[PDB]
Amino acid sequence: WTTIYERLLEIKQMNERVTKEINTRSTVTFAKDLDLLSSQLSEMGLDFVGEDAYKQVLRLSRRLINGDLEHQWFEESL
DNA sequence: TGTCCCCCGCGTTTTAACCGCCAAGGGGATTACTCCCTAGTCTCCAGGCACGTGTCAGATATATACATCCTGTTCTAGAGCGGCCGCC
């Protein structure tokens, strides 16, 4: 219990910076013109943009417990 | 018959094997829509098969000729023997 608590504290303490970095992810216009940005996780909805990272990773953990996340993709999302 | 070096029986310490357990994700297995070319004819015709035959390379023949193997004679190296020489 305390180990999972410390892991969630490590998630939440940097969450206010990670969410700000993701929400202000300035994509390169030249990479968008040439189709160079990574859209591997954006097709299945694994992107963290436009939402809080902690609630999204709680939902991701719930579905990974449910066994329909194809776990290595969840590793890539993390 | 010998021998010695190559393999076997066993002590010891690593070393990976098998079961215990967990997901994954290509991949075997199944079902269905569709589509080409293979089953089956019609006709024929040009390549394939039966027959006849001039022929051109293989075999028989034999003196000549290879061709290597077996054997006889000689060359040269090695061990044994005897004569000569120096020392006690």
Name the experiment that determined this structure. Answer: cryo-EM
Name the token pair of A7.
């892991």
- The DSSP code for A51 is S
Which bases of strand B sit closer than 7 A to a protein CB?
23-25
Percent helix, strand and coil across chain A, each to the nearest 5:
60, 0, 40
Q: Which nucleotide is nearest to A73 (CA to C1')?
A: B24
Give backbone dihedrals phi and psi of A58, rounded to 5 degrees, phi first. Answer: -65, -45
**Measured in whole angstroms, how far is the alpha carbon of residue A27 from the centre of its chain?**
16
Query: Which residues make Cβ contacts (< 8 Å) with residue A68, sequence separation at least 6?
Result: none
